[PDB]
Design a protein around this ligand. Sequence first.
Ligand SMILES: *[C@@H]1O[C@H](CO)[C@@H](O[C@@H]2O[C@H](CO)[C@@H](O[C@@H]3O[C@H](CO[C@H]4O[C@H](CO)[C@@H](O)[C@H](O)[C@@H]4O)[C@@H](O)[C@H](O[C@H]4O[C@H](CO)[C@@H](O)[C@H](O)[C@@H]4O)[C@@H]3O[C@@H]3OC[C@@H](O)[C@H](O)[C@H]3O)[C@H](O)[C@H]2NC(C)=O)[C@H](O[C@@H]2O[C@@H](C)[C@@H](O)[C@@H](O)[C@@H]2O)[C@H]1NC(C)=O
Ligand SMILES: *[C@@H]1O[C@H](CO)[C@@H](O[C@@H]2O[C@H](CO)[C@@H](O[C@@H]3O[C@H](CO)[C@@H](O)[C@H](O[C@H]4O[C@H](CO)[C@@H](O)[C@H](O)[C@@H]4O)[C@@H]3O[C@@H]3OC[C@@H](O)[C@H](O)[C@H]3O)[C@H](O)[C@H]2NC(C)=O)[C@H](O)[C@H]1NC(C)=O
Ligand SMILES: *[C@@H]1O[C@H](CO)[C@@H](O[C@@H]2O[C@H](CO)[C@@H](O[C@@H]3O[C@H](CO)[C@@H](O)[C@H](O)[C@@H]3O[C@@H]3OC[C@@H](O)[C@H](O)[C@H]3O)[C@H](O)[C@H]2NC(C)=O)[C@H](O[C@@H]2O[C@@H](C)[C@@H](O)[C@@H](O)[C@@H]2O)[C@H]1NC(C)=O
Ligand SMILES: *[C@@H]1O[C@H](CO)[C@@H](O[C@@H]2O[C@H](CO)[C@@H](O[C@@H]3O[C@H](CO)[C@@H](O)[C@H](O)[C@@H]3O)[C@H](O)[C@H]2NC(C)=O)[C@H](O[C@@H]2O[C@@H](C)[C@@H](O)[C@@H](O)[C@@H]2O)[C@H]1NC(C)=O
Ligand SMILES: *[C@@H]1O[C@H](CO)[C@@H](O[C@@H]2O[C@H](CO)[C@@H](O)[C@H](O)[C@H]2NC(C)=O)[C@H](O[C@@H]2O[C@@H](C)[C@@H](O)[C@@H](O)[C@@H]2O)[C@H]1NC(C)=O
Ligand SMILES: *[C@@H]1O[C@H](CO)[C@@H](O)[C@H](O)[C@H]1NC(C)=O
Ligand SMILES: OC[C@H]1NC[C@H](O)[C@@H](O)[C@H]1O
Ligand SMILES: OC[C@H]1NC[C@H](O)[C@@H](O)[C@H]1O
Lengths: 391, 390
Amino acid sequence: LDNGLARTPTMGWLHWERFMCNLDCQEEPDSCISEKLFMEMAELMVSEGWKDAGYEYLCIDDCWMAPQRDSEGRLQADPQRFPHGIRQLANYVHSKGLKLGIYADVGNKTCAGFPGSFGYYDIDAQTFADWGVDLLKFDGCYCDSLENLADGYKHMSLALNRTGRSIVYSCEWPLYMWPFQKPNYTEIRQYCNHWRNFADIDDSWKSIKSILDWTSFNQERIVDVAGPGGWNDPDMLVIGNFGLSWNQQVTQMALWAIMAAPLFMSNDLRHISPQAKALLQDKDVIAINQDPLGKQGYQLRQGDNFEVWERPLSGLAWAVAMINRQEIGGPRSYTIAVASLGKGVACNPACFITQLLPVKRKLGFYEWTSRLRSHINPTGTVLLQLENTMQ
Amino acid sequence: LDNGLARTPTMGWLHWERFMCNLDCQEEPDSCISEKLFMEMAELMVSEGWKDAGYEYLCIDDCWMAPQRDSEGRLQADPQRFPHGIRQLANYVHSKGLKLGIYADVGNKTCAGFPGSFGYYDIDAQTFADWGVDLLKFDGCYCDSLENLADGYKHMSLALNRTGRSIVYSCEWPLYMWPFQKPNYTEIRQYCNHWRNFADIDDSWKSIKSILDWTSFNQERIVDVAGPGGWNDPDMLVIGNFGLSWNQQVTQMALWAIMAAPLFMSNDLRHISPQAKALLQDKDVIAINQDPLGKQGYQLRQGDNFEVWERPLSGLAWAVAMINRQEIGGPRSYTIAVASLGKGVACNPACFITQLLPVKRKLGFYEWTSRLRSHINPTGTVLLQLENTM
Ligand SMILES: *[C@@H]1O[C@H](CO)[C@@H](O[C@@H]2O[C@H](CO)[C@@H](O[C@@H]3O[C@H](CO[C@H]4O[C@H](CO)[C@@H](O)[C@H](O)[C@@H]4O)[C@@H](O)[C@H](O[C@H]4O[C@H](CO)[C@@H](O)[C@H](O)[C@@H]4O)[C@@H]3O[C@@H]3OC[C@@H](O)[C@H](O)[C@H]3O)[C@H](O)[C@H]2NC(C)=O)[C@H](O[C@@H]2O[C@@H](C)[C@@H](O)[C@@H](O)[C@@H]2O)[C@H]1NC(C)=O
Ligand SMILES: *[C@@H]1O[C@H](CO)[C@@H](O[C@@H]2O[C@H](CO)[C@@H](O[C@@H]3O[C@H](CO)[C@@H](O)[C@H](O[C@H]4O[C@H](CO)[C@@H](O)[C@H](O)[C@@H]4O)[C@@H]3O[C@@H]3OC[C@@H](O)[C@H](O)[C@H]3O)[C@H](O)[C@H]2NC(C)=O)[C@H](O)[C@H]1NC(C)=O
Ligand SMILES: *[C@@H]1O[C@H](CO)[C@@H](O[C@@H]2O[C@H](CO)[C@@H](O[C@@H]3O[C@H](CO)[C@@H](O)[C@H](O)[C@@H]3O[C@@H]3OC[C@@H](O)[C@H](O)[C@H]3O)[C@H](O)[C@H]2NC(C)=O)[C@H](O[C@@H]2O[C@@H](C)[C@@H](O)[C@@H](O)[C@@H]2O)[C@H]1NC(C)=O
Ligand SMILES: *[C@@H]1O[C@H](CO)[C@@H](O[C@@H]2O[C@H](CO)[C@@H](O[C@@H]3O[C@H](CO)[C@@H](O)[C@H](O)[C@@H]3O)[C@H](O)[C@H]2NC(C)=O)[C@H](O[C@@H]2O[C@@H](C)[C@@H](O)[C@@H](O)[C@@H]2O)[C@H]1NC(C)=O
Ligand SMILES: *[C@@H]1O[C@H](CO)[C@@H](O[C@@H]2O[C@H](CO)[C@@H](O)[C@H](O)[C@H]2NC(C)=O)[C@H](O[C@@H]2O[C@@H](C)[C@@H](O)[C@@H](O)[C@@H]2O)[C@H]1NC(C)=O
Ligand SMILES: *[C@@H]1O[C@H](CO)[C@@H](O)[C@H](O)[C@H]1NC(C)=O
Ligand SMILES: OC[C@H]1NC[C@H](O)[C@@H](O)[C@H]1O
Ligand SMILES: OC[C@H]1NC[C@H](O)[C@@H](O)[C@H]1O
């Protein structure tokens, strides 16, 4: 979408995976979907270093709404959980130097069953712009027709544009289309800043694997459409939660960087391990994800329970990720000729290789005829940066 | 098996899951299956507290053998990887106050392709006794028929007995005959100290889940047959490796205790985190696993992506494990009427409840009508001990 936004993948925090649709503020006041939750995360996003690392958008997902629209046909924030209203929340978030994201649905209802925006696109766009909203995530539930789905996503894009306010537009259009027909990514890119392709992530290695496998399976269709202003969205980072081992967490961070993915954390920033925090704030890995060239990476090789992915970067550099998919035994060595990397130009005549995950280490100079050898933990990933040089 | 061994579930270390069949001693000398590896693990079992926690048996799995039997028809340790032989290894292990476990296969070959014991059961049994072996794991690969399989497992049990040496006999009899015929656990129990029922564990939450789900599904068949001298083997503990989150590690430790499982670690004791170590050496949880009454636990309840399991202990105590099987969201509130626990006698008229995992914490006295509210992390478990009080 040519709105001048998302020139690099959008970074922020989104409540959905970790907090879901918890409406139980009586029994669980600190975890329920309410203004206090977002106020606290906004505070922590600044004080704990997330904003300085690039995480800018504090985003509200489903279940923020009152059961019904007001008498003027507007969406309302729930009066018990958001008593001060979204406008005051937006102002609070902006006073911290952050941006506010919000959620709506293209159909009759949101996925959790709250009011949908079908027949209200202009009213809702204008309501969000009035409030000071900076990003909309637009879900695809309760839409009976693929025509209405496509038309709704296009209409809201235009409606947001007409407000005059710059609003990142995050779509789930291809995801709700894929079962029934092939998405047209040239069309989607014109209307959306980023788009969900695949099923909801959860806090599991199985889920990370299936997203990587579906991305690599469909990479011919989706890799080349991504670029400044329009990104593939493989869903939230679940690092810092409960279901991923340390190696599995390194794998998600590494591959979301290779894939030029929006980086939306969904975790409890009040309760995050030093390790997960250091991984998520890793300046070098974030720089890869945010590389200004904006060319999405891809799977190069697959075999022997190993995967090799690579991404072209600016300044003639490349990122290489090698995943160990064997879920038994110990570290396994993988050896690859550097001449097979970066379409033969990454280390021609030479290159400097620096390892970034799971630890930072300079590996030295590699000639075009050299072989690269790494040990990789089961379900772990080694991420390298190849810096091309004529020495 | 009535040999006076495994009166509580056997505890130790087994190389297979973490080290497997690595023969590349040229390029990976510290990780290949060699006498060096087992000598190093032995040293660490003593120095780092493993022996004191109860982990006693240092066990060799597949791929220790030479490609061929010797001229006398005996198995031989690989000459390049075990140049000092198994007898010297057994002596070294015994000098550390530990016991030695070894591996063989009922069929013509081991699963990895080395010499099998079919037609050599008495030779091998005697060879192992002569070496001073204290435990045999006996695998089921390359066995043509169910007749041979059954007869093989029985033959080796008797052969071990005839040596006069006390040897723990660890079988895979039910695992390998399940596909074709329902195992007779009464028969299996008479011949074996423990038995593998299900597929090989690996370093994944998926595999932990599958083992628990298959156990609970089959718990009517297998729970009551367990007891002092004969245990169900859900396979190795994989805590301290690569594929399990912290909560998933706690779940395995808690549930292996509930299930009266043999506790065979398969990890690198040279490279293990402090958390994984503290969990594996947790005296209170190990005491549950090793409860002298030796009654295996079972799934009590399933619903709302929660599972409740319990185990009866000695002295009118119970252990209770509540698992959160929802793999999305945050810690989830679970409330249970304590009157549902221990067949209604656990907290009649009252009980003192102590949480053991993921942290140790006295929770206080509960009356029969009370409700316990826990918070359980996704894929995590809360483990409680209930002490009945008047
Ligand atoms: C571990 O591996 C060992 C080596 O492979 C196994 O021993 C084999 O067991 C075979 C049966 O499972 C057995 O096969 C029989 O062989 C008889 C004679 O050999 C013939 O073949 C030779 C070359 O292959 C050849 O040189 C000879 O000239 C012979 O022709 C043969 O008579 C048998 O046939 C019987 O059955 C048929 C069919 O009903 C009748 O028509 C026939 O009259 C006869 O009664 C049989 O051969 C064939 O078996 C397969 C079947 O599909 C064919 O129809 C049938 O013809 C073989 O002798 C040995 N091999 C060796 C080298 O000794 C061992 O098996 C176990 O132990 C053996 C001793 C036996 O007790 C088996 O029942 C056991 O399963 C394997 N053990 C384990 C645990 O896996
Ligand atoms: C509603 O929609 C309209 C379009 O339908 C939006 O107007 C468009 O806004 C963008 C804002 O960037 C504008 O794009 C720029 O155009 C000027 C020339 O007029 C260029 O100098 C810009 O290039 C520079 O900046 C970009 C970063 O955006 C950078 O990539 C370049 O290297 C350079 O430094 C930029 O041109 C774009 O460059 C990137 C390339 O991918 C695009 O194709 C190219 O457009 C558009 O001109 C403008 N479109 C029109 C038709 O006027 C409007 O912002 C939007 N309003 C709201 C509220 O959302
Ligand atoms: C080879 O097999 C035979 C059986 O086929 C083993 O003999 C059995 O060994 C058991 C354990 O040592 C004996 O049971 C014990 O009996 C004594 C006295 O009553 C008692 O102190 C123990 O608590 C135990 O009692 C019960 O035994 C029956 C079980 O139902 C119950 O669970 C136990 O609590 C058992 O009597 C004996 N059976 C027979 C038929 O003789 C034999 O074990 C070896 O012999 C015994 C006597 C002892 O020297 C052991 O150290 C030794 O292992 C076994 N041999 C080998 C080498 O494994
Ligand atoms: C996927 O979506 C893209 C973008 O909408 C489609 O390309 C666009 O197709 C429009 C209508 O077919 C084109 O409009 C034309 O504009 C010119 C102005 O010069 C008029 O003369 C002409 O009558 C049309 O109205 C538009 O040019 C084109 N946009 C872009 C950015 O390429 C695309 O359609 C497919 O490709 C185009 C080039 C044609 O070959 C179509 O026949 C073809 O469907 C969509 N792809 C699919 C598979 O649906
Ligand atoms: C499973 O194995 C059990 C142990 O071998 C069998 O029980 C034993 O059966 C013998 C006769 O086959 C008998 O002499 C033994 O006393 C008895 N052992 C014990 C500890 O009870 C069992 O056999 C079944 O149950 C026995 C009591 C008889 O009713 C048999 O006719 C049955 O087959 C075996 N079960 C099965 C299903 O094969
Ligand atoms: C929404 O449902 C109404 C009936 O409640 C129906 O008239 C309308 O066509 C539906 N629209 C969409 C986009 O699903
Ligand atoms: O109910 C909200 C939920 N709906 C489905 C979406 O794909 C999720 O990301 C989340 O927004
Ligand atoms: O190859 C050895 C391998 N065989 C199959 C067994 O069940 C495993 O535990 C292991 O011993």
